[PDB]
Design a protein around this ligand. Structure first.
Ligand SMILES: Nc1nc2c(ncn2[C@@H]2O[C@H](COP(=O)(O)OP(=O)(O)O)[C@@H](O)[C@H]2O)c(=O)[nH]1
Ligand SMILES: [Mg+2]
Length: 181
């Protein structure tokens, strides 16, 4: 698993530094995905009391992961990670309808950051395994992804716990990060 996903990134070996942010509300499935793709050690750090960041690095690639939609007064704290971002992965809980609108706002707010203006957008509609989970289509509507313009985005159904859709999602991401600039 980690093997085949690791290969996908060989595509970007020429790139000096591939920066990938992976965000989403808490409990969307971010941490699960990191330990599921086993691309590298999930080094955890605590920049400031209460703010938890997970970092995975391998070769010229790095992932910086943290939860959004928490105490939206800490949002400026996240800016330290926007500069030179090549790709943005937004993980969403497809089964959580109560907070899908919060996800939407965090996402649209985040992709309109001057510094994230040219980042590829990968959306993981996670927890597709759950019975009453919104289909990728309904998550696309709730996240209002069709209102995104001039941006290269893609929504991918996944079950982080089993790994389904991860390879596909990353296959798309790395393919586009490659011919970006
Ligand atoms: N049913 C189901 N649960 C999942 C899936 N992905 C993650 N979870 C669970 O949802 C919770 C999210 O935790 P992670 O630690 O994954 O959360 P996050 O880092 O805050 O997004 C954990 O209880 C996971 O075991 C999935 O595809 N299906
Ligand atoms: Mg987490």
């Amino acid at each position: 698993m980690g093997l085949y996903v690791s290969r996908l990134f060989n595509r970007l070996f020429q790139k000096k530094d591939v920066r990938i942010l992976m965000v989403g509300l808490d409990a969307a499935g971010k941490t699960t995905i990191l330990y599921k793709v086993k691309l590298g050690e999930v080094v955890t750090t605590i920049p400031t009391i209460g703010f938890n960041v997970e970092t995975v690095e391998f070769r010229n690639i790095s992932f910086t992961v943290w939860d959004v939609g928490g105490q939206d007064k800490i949002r400026p704290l996240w800016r330290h990670y926007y500069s030179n971002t090549d790709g943005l992965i937004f993980v969403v809980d497809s089964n959580d309808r109560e907070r899908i609108d919060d996800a939407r706002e965090e996402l649209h707010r985040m992709i309109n950051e001057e510094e994230l203006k040219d980042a590829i957008i990968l959306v993981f509609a996670n927890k597709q395994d759950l019975p009453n989970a919104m289909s990728a289509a309904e998550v696309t509507e709730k996240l209002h992804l069709n209102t995104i313009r001039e941006r290269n985005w893609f929504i991918q159904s996944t079950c982080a716990t089993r790994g389904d859709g991860l390879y596909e999602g990353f296959d798309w991401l790395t393919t586009h990060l490659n011919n970006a600039k």
